[PDB]
């Protein structure tokens, strides 16, 4: 067991192993504050998130367990991984604090915004990342530029997947961003699958190509209006699939937009880039390209290697459907701290 040391970094008492040095706060991550630090053990720059009141409620408690489970499972270049997890607690009884340590990528995709080859590389890495998380039946749900971490090599990792609530029957505290959300999760108007994340990739890729937010909607309805202006009102075959009677009512009432020519919207874009965008930004949940299929699209010829696009090990999210006391979520998280083994360090 290591020696810890305490400091006050903006409201909060950080208590961390002596191994981590020169903590300097960089803002909020998912459910708590993040410090940049220096890892004396590895010589590396790391990010330390202190979860804010991890065990105040069932929601915080379950979400704490979820995040730690998520992180401990991901092992892939384009998906953030767990370098370390720790507590100052010396027993389960006094266990009150969780700190999660990952690599510090220099930046995220806001800060960056770009040539076509740059967009190829970055979107390529996102889809390579999504294939792996999708293959474990995990869905990001709020993929967006601020949770795409990038270093100066344009090497990219996805953060914060799997947190934004599954249905509207649950609350996880996590706040999504309107502009990158698939119309089906935003509005809950047909069922949804992993391709909610492909819609997002569509929106991010477009933005990288034009500098403009694709759909800067000011609310749910304005957002839906912006979207239909580009893709057109849904056809009779799409209407067939809308499960809600109010959504279908609303749509069939809007005065009808035609689908536009994506070439006349993405003018000056590489035509392969345009073709992919048309395959990503389709209303129909069953028709939208998947991560795997997008990886094989001509746009990515320079990057695609079927033998280096791995899938994940099976991930057991049966805990998701359980209804347990705060102390039960709490002890489960404790087990997961104690059993943590850090990634191997070669020379």
For ligand QC0, the binding residue among 123, 149, 201, 204 (CB under 6 A) is: 149
To ligand QC0, the closest distance from the beta carbon of 69 in angstroms equals: 9
Stretch that binds ligand QC0, among 7-15, 20-28, 251-259, 317-325 (CB under 6 A): 20-28
Q: Which of 39, 84, 97, 160 is catalytic?
A: 160
The 3-state secondary structure of the chain reads CCCEEEEEECCEEEEEECCEEEEEEEEEECCEEEEEEEECCCCEEEEEEEECCCCCCHHHHHHHHHHHHHHHHCCECCECCCCEEECCCCCCCCCCCCEEEEECCCEEHHHHCCCHHHHHHHHHHHHHHHHHHHCCCCCCCCCCHHHEEECCCCCEEECCCCCCCCCCCCCCCCCCCHHHCCHHHHHCCCCCCCCHHHHHHHHHHHHHHHCCCCCCCCCHHHHHHHHHHHHCCCCHHHHCCCCCHHHHHHHCCCCCCCCCCCCCCCCCCCHHHHHHHHHHCCCCCCCCCCHHHHHCCHHHCCCCCHHHCCCCCCCCCHHHHCCCCHHHHHHHHHHHHHCCCCCCCCC
Q: Whose Cβ is closer to ligand QC0: residue 150's or residue 276's?
A: 150
To ligand QC0, the closest distance from the beta carbon of 282 in angstroms equals: 27
For ligand QC0, the binding residue among 7, 28, 57, 96 (CB under 6 A) is: 28
For ligand QC0, the binding residue among 17, 88, 145, 162 (CB under 6 A) is: 162
**Is 80 among the residues that bind ligand QC0 (CB under 6 A)?**
yes
Tell me how far the alpha carbon of residue 103 is from its chain's centroid.
16
Verify whether residue 160 is a known catalytic residue. Answer: yes
To ligand QC0, the closest distance from the beta carbon of 211 in angstroms equals: 21
Q: Is 211 annotated as a binding residue?
A: no
To ligand QC0, the closest distance from the beta carbon of 110 in angstroms equals: 9
Pick out residues in 87-116 that bind ligand QC0 (CB under 6 A).
100, 102, 104, 108
Pairing of strands 12-17, 4-9: antiparallel
**Is 159 among the residues that bind ligand QC0 (CB under 6 A)?**
yes
For ligand QC0, the binding residue among 14, 16, 19, 30 (CB under 6 A) is: 30
Q: What are phi and psi of 186, to 5 degrees?
A: -65, -45
Pick out residues in 53-72 that bind ligand QC0 (CB under 6 A).
67, 70-71
**Is 266 among the residues that bind ligand QC0 (CB under 6 A)?**
no
Stretch that binds ligand QC0, among 4-12, 27-35, 218-226, 300-308 (CB under 6 A): 27-35
**Is 163 among the residues that bind ligand QC0 (CB under 6 A)?**
yes
Interacting residue ranges for ligand QC0, rule: CB under 6 A:
26-30, 34, 47, 49, 67, 70-71, 80, 100, 102, 104, 108, 149, 159-163
Residue numbering of the annotated binding site: 26-34, 49
Residue numbering of the annotated binding site for ATP: 26-34, 49
Active-site annotation, residues: 160
């Amino acid at each position: 067991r290591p020696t810890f040391y305490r400091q006050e970094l903006n409201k909060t008492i950080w208590e961390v192993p002596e191994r981590y040095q020169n903590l300097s706060p960089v803002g909020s991550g998912a459910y708590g504050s993040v410090c940049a630090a220096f890892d004396t053990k590895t010589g590396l720059r790391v990010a330390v998130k202190k979860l804010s009141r991890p065990f105040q409620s069932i929601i915080h408690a379950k979400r704490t367990y979820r995040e730690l489970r998520l992180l401990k499972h991901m092992k892939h270049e384009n998906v953030i991984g767990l370098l370390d997890v720790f507590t100052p607690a010396r027993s389960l009884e006094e266990f009150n604090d969780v700190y999660l340590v990952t690599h510090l990528m220099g930046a995220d995709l806001n800060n960056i915004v770009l040539t076509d080859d740059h967009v190829q590389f970055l979107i390529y890495q996102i889809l390579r990342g999504l294939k792996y998380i999708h293959s474990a039946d995990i869905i990001h749900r709020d993929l967006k530029p601020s949770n795409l971490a990038v270093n100066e090599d344009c090497e990219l990792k996805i953060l914060d997947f799997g947190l934004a609530r599954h249905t509207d029957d649950e609350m996880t505290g996590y706040v999504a961003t309107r502009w990158y959300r698939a119309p089906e999760i935003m509005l809950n108007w047909m069922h949804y699958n992993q391709t909610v994340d492909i819609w997002s990739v569509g929106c991010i890729m477009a933005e990288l190509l034009t500098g403009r937010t694709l759909f800067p909607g000011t609310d749910h309805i304005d957002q839906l209006k912006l979207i239909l202006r580009l893709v057109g009102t849904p056809g009779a075959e799409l209407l067939k699939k809308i499960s809600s009677e109010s959504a279908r009512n609303y749509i069939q009432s809007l005065t009808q937009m035609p689908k536009m020519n994506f070439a006349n919207v993405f003018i000056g874009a590489n035509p392969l880039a345009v073709d992919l965008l048309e395959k990503m930004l389709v209303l129909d949940s069953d028709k939208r390209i998947t991560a795997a299929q997008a990886l094989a699209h001509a746009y990515f010829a320079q990057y695609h290697d079927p033998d280096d696009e791995p899938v994940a090990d099976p991930y057991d999210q049966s805990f998701e459907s359980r209804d347990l006391l705060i102390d039960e979520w709490k002890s489960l998280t404790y087990d997961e701290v104690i059993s943590f083994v850090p990634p191997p360090l070669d020379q």
